Amino acid sequence: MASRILLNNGAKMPILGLGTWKSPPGQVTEAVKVAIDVGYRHIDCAHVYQNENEVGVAIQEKLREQVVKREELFIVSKLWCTYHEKGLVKGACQKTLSDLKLDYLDLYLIHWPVGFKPGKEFFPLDESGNVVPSDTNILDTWAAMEELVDEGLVKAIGISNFNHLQVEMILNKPGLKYKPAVNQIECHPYLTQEKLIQYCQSKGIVVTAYSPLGSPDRPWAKPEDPSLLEDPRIKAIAAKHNKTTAQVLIRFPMQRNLVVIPKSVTPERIAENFKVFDFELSSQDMTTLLSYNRNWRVCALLSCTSHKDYPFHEEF
Ligand SMILES: NC(=O)c1ccc[n+]([C@@H]2O[C@H](COP(=O)([O-])OP(=O)(O)OC[C@H]3O[C@@H](n4cnc5c(N)ncnc54)[C@H](OP(=O)(O)O)[C@@H]3O)[C@@H](O)[C@H]2O)c1
Ligand SMILES: O=C(O)Cc1nn(Cc2nc3cc(C(F)(F)F)ccc3s2)c(=O)c2ccccc12
C-alpha cells in the first residue's frame, strides 16, 4: 500500500488524513499536534467547521518545532455554500488561509454543489425552515476556483458532494482551465458508492471517503440508526485480524484506491486510526464489507432538498 496517490496537478496526496468536523476548538489543537506526531500529513478542514484558527495554531507550532516541513503536509479546505458568488470566492479562500496561518492550500474544494444566500449565517433559513438559495451556478463557481490556482493560493481544486452529472458539467465546460482533482463524498459499508466511484476513477478524479466510521457524532443521529462501529459483523472481521472495527473501516476505502479522512479528537484513537498500514483485508473481507451497502446516507440536510442543485435526487 503506497501511502500517497498522484493527483492531476502532479502532486501526491496522503491516502489517510485527519478529519476535523465536530472537533471543538478547545480540543482540536491538541488533536492535530498528536496526529502530526504519529505520522498524519493530511488534514481535512473547512471554514464551516469553525475551528480553522485552532488547526492553524497546531500546524504552526509543529513547523516551528521542526517536526515537519510545510512541503510534507497536505492541507485541504473547502469553500462554504454562502460564498459561491464569483466575487466572494477569493476572500473566502484568503480567510481560510489567514486562519490556518498558511500561504497556500494543497487542495481547495467546493464544499457542496449548492449556493446559499450570502450573509453571516452558514445555513440561512426562511420562516418555514427551507434553506435560502443563492442564484449561483456550478460553472461560475468553478471558474472562480480556477482563478485561485492561477494566483497561487491553492495548488489543486476539487469538489465535494457532487453527483456524476454535476461532475460532468464541469468536465464539459468549454474553456475549462483545471479539471477537478478530487471529489470528496460520503463512503462507508452502508453507502458504498460503487457507481460514483467507478465514474470518478474512470475520469481520473481521486475520490476521498468522508464519514468512514459512519459519523456517530453527527448532530442528527437517531438511536434507531445503523451504527457501523457497533456492527457485530464488522467486529468479527476486525477480530480475525486482531484489529479494531475502526481500523477495518479505515483500511476498507484504502484498498478501493480511495483517500480516507477519519475524525477524532481523542489522542488514543488518533494513534489507533493511523495503525492501518500493517495488515490487509482479504478479498472475502472486501466483498463482505461491500455487501453491507444499504444506500444509507448520514449527510443530507432535509432543509436543502428543494435546492435546484441538490445532489442526491440522482441515482449517483
Ligand atoms: N465534504 C463534506 O461535506 C464532509 C461531510 C462530512 C465529513 N467530512 C470530513 O470527513 C471527516 C470524517 O467524517 P465524520 O467526522 O463525519 O465522522 P467519522 O470520521 O466517520 O466518525 C468520527 C466519530 O468517530 C469517533 N471515533 C474516531 N475514531 C474512533 C475509534 N478508533 N473508535 C471509536 N470511535 C472513534 C469520533 O470520536 P472522537 O472524535 O470523540 O474520538 C467521532 O465521534 C470529517 O471530520 C470532515 O473532515 C466532510
Ligand atoms: O458539510 C460538512 O462537511 C459536514 C456537515 N454536514 N451537515 C449536513 C449537510 N448537508 C448538506 C446538504 C447540502 C445540499 F447540497 F445537499 F444541498 C448542502 C450543505 C449541507 S451541510 C451539516 O448540517 C453541517 C453543519 C455544520 C458543519 C458541518 C456540517
Question: Measuring from atom 47 of ligand 1, which residue has the nearest CA?
Answer: 19
- Ligand 1 touching residue 139 (CB < 6 A): no
CA distance linking residue 244 with residue 213, whole number of Å: 12
CA nearest neighbour of 199 among 169, 165, 174, 250: 165
Cell of 222: 437517531
Q: Is 110 annotated as a binding residue?
A: no
Residue among 45, 54, 210, 298 to mutate when testing ligand 1 (max atoms within 8 A of CB): 210
44 touches 18 (CB < 8 A): yes
Which atom in ligand 1 lies closest to the alpha carbon of residue 273?
31
Which atom in ligand 1 lies closest to the alpha carbon of residue 21?
45
Angle between helices 245-254 and 267-274 (to 10 degrees): 40
CA nearest neighbour of 13 among 92, 83, 55, 74: 74
Q: Is 268 annotated as a binding residue?
A: yes
- Ligand 1 touching residue 216 (CB < 6 A): yes
Q: Resolution in angstroms, to 1 decimal, for this deposition?
A: 1.1
Q: Is 234 annotated as a binding residue?
A: yes
- Ligand 2 touching residue 162 (CB < 6 A): no
User: Which ligand ends up closest to the CA of 48?
Assistant: 2
- Ligand 2 touching residue 80 (CB < 6 A): no
Breaks, C-N > 2.5 A, in the chain lie after: none
Q: Is 119 annotated as a binding residue?
A: no
- Ligand 2 touching residue 176 (CB < 6 A): no
- Ligand 2 touching residue 112 (CB < 6 A): yes
- How far the first Cα of the chain sits from its last, in Å, is 28
Q: Is 225 annotated as a binding residue?
A: yes
Question: Measuring from atom 19 of ligand 2, which residue has the nearest CA?
Answer: 112
Residue among 47, 116, 213, 259 to mutate when testing ligand 1 (max atoms within 8 A of CB): 213
Q: What residue ranges define each of the domains in the chain, with the CATH number in brackets?
A: 1-316 (3.20.20.100)
83 belongs to the catalytic site: no
Pairing mode, strands 12-14 and 4-6: antiparallel
205 touches 181 (CB < 8 A): yes
Determination technique for this entry: X-ray
Which atom in ligand 1 lies closest to the alpha carbon of residue 272?
31
Kindly report the length of the chain.
Answer: 316
Angle between helices 245-254 and 283-290 (to 10 degrees): 100
